[PDB]
Write a protein that binds this ligand. Structure first.
Ligand SMILES: [Cl-]
Ligand SMILES: [Cl-]
Ligand SMILES: [Cl-]
Length: 163
């Protein structure tokens, strides 16, 4: 575990993270995809061997000794708000199980279902709150990655609010 488990946020490509493992915002089919998933495919392509997994689940595949946790959030274009919210919560609970199983002291994590799976809605708060619900009982240092300047400020404010 980390000596004083923390949350932090950085605005940069998660493929350049400084953590002991990475969470991919994966598709269910283990395809290269777009956005975070394509960056992860370019950096750790070996981790996409048998990475397909259903919505609401996470599947870890090692790239050398570096763990890539493929977490599949719902596409809100296809799910109802209610069923999508349940699958998004579930994907983050499966990430917390994997992070714990791996025994890492730190993890790089994107906000699931906030990009092309958002169904055209702002889901910063919804996705971040499910991230906290899952990860608060873990003792890994969590570093959240984002690309937008306004999102960086809002994520940082939300972390600081809990102290
Ligand atoms: Cl960058
Ligand atoms: Cl997404
Ligand atoms: Cl972002």
């Amino acid at each position: 575990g980390a000596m004083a488990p923390s949350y932090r946020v950085k605005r940069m490509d998660i493929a350049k993270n400084d953590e002991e493992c990475v969470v991919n915002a994966a598709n269910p089919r283990g395809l290269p995809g777009d956005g975070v998933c394509k960056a992860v495919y370019k950096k750790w392509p070996e981790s996409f061997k048998n990475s397909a997994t259903p919505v609401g689940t996470a599947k870890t595949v090692m790239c050398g000794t570096y763990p890539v946790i493929h977490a599949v959030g719902p596409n809100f274009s296809n799910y109802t708000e209610s069923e999508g919210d349940r699958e998004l919560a579930a994907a983050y609970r499966e990430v917390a199980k994997e992070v714990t199983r791996l025994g890492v002291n730190s993890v790089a994590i994107p906000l699931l279902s906030t990009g092309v799976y958002s169904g055209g809605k702002d889901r910063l708060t919804q996705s971040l709150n499910h991230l906290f619900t899952a990860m608060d009982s873990t003792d890994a240092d969590v570093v959240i990655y984002c690309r937008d300047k306004e999102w960086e400020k809002k994520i940082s404010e939300a972390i600081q609010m809990r102290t």
